[PDB]
Fold this protein.
Amino acid sequence: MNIFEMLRIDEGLRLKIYKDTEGYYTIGIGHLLTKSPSLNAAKSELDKAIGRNTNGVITKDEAEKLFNQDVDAAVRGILRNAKLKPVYDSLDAVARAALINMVFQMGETGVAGFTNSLRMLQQKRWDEAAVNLAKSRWYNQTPNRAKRVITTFRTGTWDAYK
Ligand SMILES: [Cl-]
Ligand SMILES: [Cl-]
C-alpha cells in the first residue's frame, strides 16, 4: 500500500464531472474543479486543466495525470508549510501518508489549523491525537474516511485499508 493506492480508495475514480461530499464540482480521483455553483464554470476549469475541449468527460489516463499532479502538489505544499513541515519530518512513513491524505482532502490551510492534534502527533502521543482528531467537523462529515486516516496515524500500519 502507498499514498496513491490509499487516496484511490478514499476518493474513488469518476470520469465525468460529479459533485463531491461538499457539493462541489469534481472529476477523476478527487480533483476539485471549482467551488462555484456553475457547471459551465466547472467545464471551463476542466478544459483548462486538461488542455482540450472535454465536454466534461476525461479518460482514465487523464485522470491519473491530474492525480499525480495533485499528490505532488500536496507533498510540496506540506514541505513549504512552516506548521506542517516539522510534523511531517517527525513522522514514520505510514503516518506521513495519513498527513498527505488529509492535506489532499482539506488543503494545507485546513490541516494547519488542527494545531492541537499536530502537536500531539509530533510528540508521538498516538491515542491522544486520535481522540483530538475526532473532535472536528472533518470527522463528523466524513466519519468513515476520517476513521481510516485516524487509525493510520494511531497504529502506523495500513490495517484500515486492508
Ligand atoms: Cl490543474
Ligand atoms: Cl466517510
In short: Residues 152 and 158 are 6 Å apart (CA to CA). The longest strand covers residues 14-19. The pocket of chloride ion (ligand 1) is lined by residues 49 (CB under 6 Å). The domain at 1-162 is CATH 1.10.530.40 (Lysozyme).
